[PDB]
Amino acid sequence: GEFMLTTLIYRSQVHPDRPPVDLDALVHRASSKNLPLGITGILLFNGLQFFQVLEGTEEALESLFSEIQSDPRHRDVVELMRDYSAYRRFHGTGMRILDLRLFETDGALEEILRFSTFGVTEPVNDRMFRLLSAFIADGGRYCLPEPL
């Protein structure tokens, strides 16, 4: 049957001691799976963590995200979100990592936008964007506000 959409989002880590990730091959094998699965989204990397924006059938988001925590690469993958939806923000891009090590807060965020075609109501109070920009902004444990 035809079931409504959903947006699951999660974030993990990586090997702080071992070498970098194959963020080219890592996302490639992912898109190939999510595409036919009907899933869509974007991945991120800051040299320590992985942020993924999954948007598709809830039944797929769970299993997928479950396949993720079963991976040996990262480690602390935790469900950041999971909200009901009726539309797809990323139309055409099944999976696409974002080596933030290349961009920055406003930079990386721009990346998403340029290929996100986000035309929803408003990315403002967007539950997903909350996390998305939080990873782009803080990338894990901030230190800008409240000094010593």
Ligand X SMILES: Cc1cc2nc3c(=O)[nH]c(=O)nc-3n(C[C@H](O)[C@H](O)[C@H](O)COP(=O)(O)O)c2cc1C
Q: Closest separation between CB of residue 12 and ligand X, Å?
A: 6
Question: What Å distances lie between residue 121 and 5, 41, 82, 85, CA to CA?
Answer: 16, 18, 18, 12
**Residue 59 interacts with ligand X (CB under 6 A): yes or no:** no
**Residue 80 interacts with ligand X (CB under 6 A): yes or no:** no
Contact window for ligand X (CB under 6 A) among 24-32, 83-91, 114-122, 132-140: 24-32
Given 15, 20, 29, 59, the residue binding ligand X (CB under 6 A)? 29
**Residue 82 interacts with ligand X (CB under 6 A): yes or no:** no
Residue appearing with tokens 């809830």: 58
Helices marked H in 11-146 — which ranges? 25-37, 58-68, 105-116, 127-137
Tokens in use for 36?
């036919």
For the chain, count helices (H), then strands (E): 4, 4
Distance CA 82, CA 98 (A): 21
User: Is 34 marked within a binding site?
Assistant: yes
Residue 56 has φ and ψ, to the nearest 5°, of 175, -160
User: Is 114 marked within a binding site?
Assistant: no
**Residue 130 interacts with ligand X (CB under 6 A): yes or no:** no
Given 13, 26, 69, 127, the residue binding ligand X (CB under 6 A)? 26
Please give the annotated binding residues for FMN, written as ranges: 29, 33-34, 52, 67, 71, 73
Q: Which residues bind ligand X (CB under 6 A)?
A: 26, 29-30, 33-34, 50, 52, 64, 68, 71, 73-74, 95
